[PDB]
Design a protein around this ligand. Structure first.
Ligand code: DGA
Ligand code: TBA
Ligand code: F09
Lengths: 219, 212, 103, 219
């Protein structure tokens, strides 16, 4: 089972506040410390703060601007980080990590992509990508899914509920008028399609919408 | 003794932006560094004690960080009141030593000077002297030139100028130009002119007065 | 109250006075010596405690003559006071063992 | 109340000696140390020495030339610094500070501007600065006071006993034949003058003379 469970994303207006979560499972001792690490797109890891849930004391990085408040709830084994007065500089991926009081972060969470914007949440649109009627196919065949018009990030696209990962490319999104757009590639052998079904699973946690889309040939 | 280097000596920051001051110690002093603020013609004021501890009365935008040899004084969203010199001081080893100091200056928008000309008063003429004072107040940038014309002819003799540091109330600069003459020389002329050429105008800002 | 318990309590109070006086006199002796770190009272008190207990971490140490003479007094006062406590415990155990033997 | 009280200025002849003061008020403990800091015009802070009034021991900066002697008087709660054989290099602003024996200087004094010169003390002359008869005034109006012919420094000029500080500029003095000269600007709204009085308070501590001067319009 996953040890630290974080939400997918949180859309915050400029100046508004948000409270992130990090549900802990597995072995829990009185010597546990929950840490929070901030990582902006195109930057390294940045230590935010720590908290010991068995006592409630929280420490914070004194080099950076203090915009966080760390709480803990022993009844539900969940730590919380409350971010206040957010600007674009606060838009990053926020991980939580568990330290057994011996220095290193043995387990990390998936991280919550926090996007500070003035826009609005838009679920994505998924479109099949099949080769045209005139297309010579080799021993393999490439299919795709087009995820366009979503905000904010991220989107997690899988192929056949994750059972298909080899030969899968997912290109980074491009921002176009407060909307993101990406595509995902998959390369199955030519004999396996369309006999064996090929679907893409586009999950957009910011809108709580996960959508499938089968790739059937054109005519 | 412990050496405290503060580099650079001058930091230029636009309004509303974070600014960090650096203080490096010649040897490790843990967290025994203390920060002070000194405005123009003012006494030093304690801002941060023991590297990162707050002081009562100091605004929340002031903070500190670091331990060992490198220490930082940070100001979140700089304001005009923050224009001053900033010193660090160590208390780990005797004797206590200070840093050389770092000045903070703000890059505000360009502002045209407000020029004012003042004739000599009655209380000064009775002492045999006279002074025409010109105030070049609240301009930005700091570069400015004053020109004195007596009866249309340029005057450069006996003109003392005086610039102020960056004003801590509005981040601007101010200048005073004073031409001093005797009562006889002041009475042998009529027109006195103060001309201020500044970046904010291709034409000089002119202020004059006649004895009529 | 028996003597050995009264003497222990007296030694504890005396030790606190030595710690406080030792912290004040160390700063007074160490300031003026370049490189000295025993120059502020809060850590001087911490240094005095770890001296009377003879722990001696090494984070603080006197360099002047009178700062080290203060240290010597703190050392002796700490060793003696805790030794008197041990001596009082021995008397308690021996006195209890006499009653346990009927004598 | 002010905690450390120092004189305004002291004029010393080259080679002569002077004794500065620093009256202490507020909470006073046996762990108090009084420090002295020297600051020449256009230089940083320079530690001079310290003294513990509850014992009388004084320490001095061994890097610089020793020209000071620190005494204390517990009956009047006043520390004294005696400077001997002064040259132009000793002309500076001398602050006193109180340290609670924990490292930092929690409170500073106003400082005594010490000027070592061969000249003589001259009180200043204050002159009004009102706009001429032909002068177009906007929504505001600027007035001034001319402080000329004084020695030595400094002069503390206030407007309306200090009640007017916004819109006040005081230019640095210029030295002209062993005499200083400066001006002070004040900008009040045009409607407030001359209905509401506007005066400048020029205090010259070196001569123990504080002079007021009202700014009335010309004719
Ligand atoms: C039993 C004695 C306890 C020893 C622990 C002291 C740790 C001091 C410290 O690490 O201090 C830590 C703390 C700041 O971190 O200091 C502070 O302010 C709080 C502590 C204040 C204690 C100092 C008061 C005066 C010291 C007596 C010397 C004579 C005075 C005259
Ligand atoms: C567990 C602490 C024991 C430390 N002692 C006695 C305490 C005195 C404060 C040091 C005496 C040294 C004079 C005994 C060590 C004997 C090896
Ligand atoms: C051991 C006696 C106490 C030390 C005497 C005071 C410290 C010397 C100050 O110069």
């Amino acid at each position: 089972q996953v040890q630290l469970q974080q939400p997918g994303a949180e859309l915050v207006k400029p100046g508004a506040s948000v409270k992130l979560s990090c549900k802990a499972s597995g072995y829990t001792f009185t010597s546990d410390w929950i840490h929070w690490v901030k990582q902006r797109p195109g930057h390294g890891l940045e230590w935010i703060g720590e908290i010991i849930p068995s006592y409630g004391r929280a420490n914070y990085n004194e080099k950076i601007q203090k915009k966080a408040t760390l709480t803990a709830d022993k009844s539900s084994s969940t730590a919380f980080m409350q971010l206040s007065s957010l600007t674009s500089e606060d838009s990053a991926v926020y991980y939580c990590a568990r330290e057994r009081g011996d220095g290193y972060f043995a387990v990390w969470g998936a991280g919550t992509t926090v996007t500070v914007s003035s826009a609005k949440t838009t679920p994505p649109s998924v479109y099949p990508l099949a080769p045209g009627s005139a297309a010579q196919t080799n021993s393999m065949v490439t299919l795709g899914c087009l995820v366009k018009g979503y905000f904010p990030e991220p989107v997690t696209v899988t192929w056949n509920s994750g059972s298909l990962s080899s030969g899968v490319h997912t290109f980074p999104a491009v921002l176009q008028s407060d909307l993101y757009t990406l595509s995902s590639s998959v390369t199955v052998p030519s004999s396996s399609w369309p006999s064996e079904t090929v679907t893409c699973n586009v999950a957009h946690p910011a809108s709580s919408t996960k959508v499938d889309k089968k790739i059937v040939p054109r005519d | 003794d412990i050496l405290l280097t503060q580099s650079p000596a001058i930091l230029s920051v636009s309004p509303g932006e974070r600014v960090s001051f650096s203080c490096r110690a010649s040897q490790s002093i843990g967290t025994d560094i203390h920060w002070y603020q000194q405005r123009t013609n003012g006494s030093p004021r304690l801002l941060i004690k023991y590297a990162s501890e707050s002081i009562s009365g100091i605004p929340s935008r002031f903070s500190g960080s670091g331990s060992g040899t490198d220490f930082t004084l940070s100001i979140n969203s700089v304001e005009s009141e923050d224009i001053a010199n900033y010193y660090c001081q160590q208390s780990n080893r005797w004797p206590f030593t200070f840093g050389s100091g770092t000045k903070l200056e703000i890059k505000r928008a360009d502002a045209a000077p407000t020029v004012s000309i003042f004739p000599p008063s009655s209380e000064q003429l009775t002492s045999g002297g006279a002074s025409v004072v010109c105030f070049l107040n609240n301009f930005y940038p700091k570069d400015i030139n004053v020109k004195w014309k007596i009866d249309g002819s340029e005057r450069q003799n006996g003109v003392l100028n005086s610039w102020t540091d960056q004003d801590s109330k509005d981040s601007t600069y101010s200048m005073s130009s004073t031409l001093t003459l005797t009562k006889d020389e002041y009475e042998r002329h009529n027109s006195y002119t103060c001309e201020a050429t500044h970046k904010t105008s291709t034409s000089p800002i002119v202020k004059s007065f006649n004895r009529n | 109250s028996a003597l050995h318990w009264r003497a222990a309590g007296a030694a504890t109070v005396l030790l606190v006075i030595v710690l406080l006086a030792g912290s004040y006199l160390a700063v007074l002796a160490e300031r003026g010596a370049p490189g000295a770190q025993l120059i502020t009272y809060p850590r001087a008190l911490w240094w005095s405690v770890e001296t009377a207990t003879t722990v001696g971490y090494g984070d603080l140490a006197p360099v002047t003559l009178w700062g080290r003479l203060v240290a010597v007094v703190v050392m002796v006062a700490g060793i003696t006071s805790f030794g008197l406590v041990t001596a009082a415990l021995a008397t308690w155990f021996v006195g209890r063992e006499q009653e346990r033997r009927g004598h």
